[PDB]
Design a protein around this ligand. Structure first.
Ligand SMILES: Fc1ccc(CNC[C@H]2CCCO2)cc1
Length: 460
């Protein structure tokens, strides 16, 4: 029975509005409704992994697991195994996998982050799950961010707190936050970003939605504009939106958007918005393709509609050779040549690098670099040909060309990371000096760049 090199992953996000679901929710898991939908000829083909994020979920874990599992069994005639379930308040994540995957899945982690302070602490935040699927690390985050059209900057702050403080994946990757710990990271939820148009335009917006004319609405979507200005979700992807706004509906129909201010809304308007979103970030040159992104039309218990997204994702096998794991393979080496970091910092500490990768027995610390001043005010840290030669555990190019090197640049004075990035070993050539590049971030914001050349020796 061969190991897969690609799996499909279902991501769902649904703010249930504190109401029990209707008796049939299969359209969600089939990616049917509006937007980029799944072909009918695939309806009986199970996804490998289903990740369900809810917000304002009124059900017990047991109640929701029975609904989810019975839904999937009806669609696929497969009884899924529960990988993980984690709930913070009314925010929940469930991961289900085909039974054949049970022994491929290990290192299962869960965590949550509560956002805000005092007044603003007690219902918003995120839950997440991570695990290994054979040689591939997968992370999933369901967040319920701050509500309200005038609170986009709080949502952005909620995002940074979640990526800083959510503790998932390999704890040995100490300089790295969740935006660098996984081959594939999916971040979804009720992100609560709104269409920023004047209140007076509510009926105009409704008109546009009825005509399926979303362009002048998407151009005011706060998540798209904040991303374009690099204020949030830096280096994440989102599929183009081709479905109607998923909030705020009158319950029990989808014919009406309920936008006007009421005591129940704190006297706030809720113009039609794409609150409910799925984004992802995968390591460079790893296969990931969105094959659906849309909303259901027939699940109407909540003031939100469910949102689905599905993905092809590249995965790798748990590689064994006669040498590694348990030793190095001296037919392999990674040389970083003529490298330099460009940093936005004003500090004048010396810096060193750490190289982290599951192709190494343990992380590798460099010598300190040589600081120079850039012509436009920047710090340039030069490493020369001084960098340690990295000794991978396995030299076979079928393994090594699929790996990645995480890089942290750290202050000698504080040992704190000033920037994190990732280099793919999926090179055009071996035994050849080739350019490499990564942006560097810290707490998910841009702090600099790392560039230079690499020379990769494999056993071929
Ligand atoms: F749904 C799931 C999926 C995975 C698991 C954990 N399986 C661990 C692997 C390694 C050791 C033997 O199986 C439980 C439930």
């Amino acid at each position: 029975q061969p190991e897969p090199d690609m799996i499909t992953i279902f991501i769902g996000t649904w703010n249930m509005g504190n109401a029990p679901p209707p008796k049939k929710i299969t359209s969600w898991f089939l990616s049917k409704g509006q937007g980029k939908t799944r072909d009918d000829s695939a309806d009986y083909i199970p996804h490998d992994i289903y990740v369900i994020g809810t917000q304002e979920d009124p059900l017990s874990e047991k109640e929701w697991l029975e609904i989810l599992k019975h839904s999937l069994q009806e669609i696929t005639s497969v009884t899924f195994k529960t990988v993980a379930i984690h709930t913070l308040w009314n925010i929940r994540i469930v991961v289900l996998a085909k039974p054949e995957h049970e022994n491929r899945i290990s290192h299962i982690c869960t965590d949550n982050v509560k956002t805000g302070i005092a007044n603003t602490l007690g219902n918003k935040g995120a839950v997440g799950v991570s695990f290994m699927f054979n040689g591939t690390s997968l992370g999933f985050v369901n967040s319920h961010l701050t509500s309200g059209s005038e609170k986009k900057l709080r949502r952005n702050q909620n995002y940074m707190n979640i990526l800083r403080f959510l503790a998932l994946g390999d704890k040995k990757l100490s300089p790295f936050n969740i935006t660098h710990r996984f081959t594939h990271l999916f971040w979804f939820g009720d992100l609560n970003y709104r269409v920023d148009l004047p209140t007076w335009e509510a009926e105009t917006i409704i008109q546009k939605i009825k005509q399926q004319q979303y362009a002048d609405l998407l151009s005011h979507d706060q998540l798209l504009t904040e991303r374009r200005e690099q204020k949030v979700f830096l280096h994440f992807e989102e599929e183009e939106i081709t479905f109607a706004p998923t909030y705020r509906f009158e319950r029990l129909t989808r014919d009406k958007y309920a936008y006007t201010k009421q005591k129940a809304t704190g006297m706030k308007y809720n113009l039609p918005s794409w609150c409910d979103r799925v984004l992802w970030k995968s390591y460079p040159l790893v296969h990931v393709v969105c094959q659906s992104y849309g909303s259901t039309s027939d699940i109407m218990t909540s003031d939100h509609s469910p949102v689905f997204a599905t993905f092809e994702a590249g995965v790798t096998s748990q590689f064994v050779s006669k040498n590694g794991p348990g030793t190095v393979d001296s037919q392999g080496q990674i040389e970083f040549l003529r490298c330099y970091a460009t940093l936005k910092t004003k500090s004048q500490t010396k810096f060193y690098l750490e190289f982290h990768s599951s192709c190494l027995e343990s992380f590798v610390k460099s010598q300190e670099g040589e600081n120079e001043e850039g012509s436009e005010g920047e710090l340039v840290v030069k490493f020369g040909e001084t960098l340690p030669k990295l000794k991978p555990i396995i030299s076979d190019p079928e393994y090594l060309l699929d790996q990645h090197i995480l890089i942290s640049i750290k202050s000698s004075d504080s040992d704190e990371s000033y920037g994190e990035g990732c280099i793919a070993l999926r090179l055009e050539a071996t035994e050849t000096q080739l350019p490499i590049y990564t942006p560097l971030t810290h707490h998910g914001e841009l702090t600099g760049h790392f560039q230079g050349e690499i020379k990769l020796q494999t056993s071929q």
